Amino acid sequence: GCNKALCASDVSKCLIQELCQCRPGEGNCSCCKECMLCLGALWDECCDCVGMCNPRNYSDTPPTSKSTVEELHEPIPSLFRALTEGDTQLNWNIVSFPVAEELHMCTVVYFDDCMSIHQCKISCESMGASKYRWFHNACCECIGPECIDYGSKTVKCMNCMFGTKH
Amino acid sequence: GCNKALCASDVSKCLIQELCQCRPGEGNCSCCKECMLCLGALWDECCDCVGMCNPRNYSDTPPTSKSTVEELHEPIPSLFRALTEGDTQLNWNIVSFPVAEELHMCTVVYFDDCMSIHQCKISCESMGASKYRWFHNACCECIGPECIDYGSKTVKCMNCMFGTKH
């Protein structure tokens, strides 16, 4: 957790001054601002040592955790509805879920085969979608005109689940 | 706009069949699903030619238009408030705006100097932030515990506005 070699010198220096005596983890941390200033440049690599921040290296960042979202210029909502409602394309997985779940209803299209971001924007753009979300596992999710936000965080698109549990 | 060389053959073929006679741009487009099927693989590169989708190359995608958003594991809201409320760090620009504007109040921290995404996550993580948004101009925006969503789309962080008008 704590990087002892980098932090042992400076981290102890604050402790002698008696800073960083307050745990943010439960309750208010009055000293938190003072503790950060005493650490200075080492706060990023040493806030764990004083308990002010989560341990540095414990989780292996799944690729799905990142997604990149852009809003398409000049959306064409009528097209998006027309291609969604009817017998959908096999390449397309269509999910409608209640709007504001991610935080009437929000409908998104999940492309099957994994694709590059630039293709994903183009494919959504050809669909008239208001927005697209690109998971860093490379799953592509077009966002319908109705949807308030960026749609579901779930990597629900078939034939590219790499980056998900089991 | 239209890529004549790729699309002239196939696009005309649908027109002879009398598909793609309906404009999505105003009103319902009944034929839109049929038009896409007739184009098939060329829909991405040729939907513009039939008017079903926006012209291919007209806008120079600003870097700020993309942003990548991840939700931090194990946020520490007390720390985020403590370092925000008081006399803020010069490196940090603190913006509070009403919550749900982007779609009580949402507070975000805009790092000054432009930084890599991995540093941006770490810097937000040391701050206890629930989430971070990284603009592809490389501006970094930590997201406060209060904020419902991913915070402001604006690239409001000082000393890295590259990717914005004028």
Numbering used by the authors:
A (entry chain A), B (entry chain A): 25 to 127, 165 to 227
Question: What do the paper's sentences say?
Answer:
Twisted gastrulation (TWSG1) is an evolutionarily conserved secreted glycoprotein which controls signaling by Bone Morphogenetic Proteins (BMPs). TWSG1 is composed of two distinct, disulfide-rich domains.
The structure of TWSG1 reveals a modular architecture, comprising an α-helical N-terminal domain (NTD, Cys26–Arg80) connected by an extended 18 Å-long linker to a mixed-α/β C-terminal domain (CTD, Pro87–Phe223). Search of structural homologs among all previously determined structures in the Protein Data Bank (PDB) did not yield any hits highlighting TWSG1’s unique structural folds and their arrangement. Remarkably, a relatively small NTD of ~50 amino acid residues contains 7 disulfide bonds and thus serves as a stable, rigid scaffold suitable to mediate TWSG1 interactions with its binding partners.
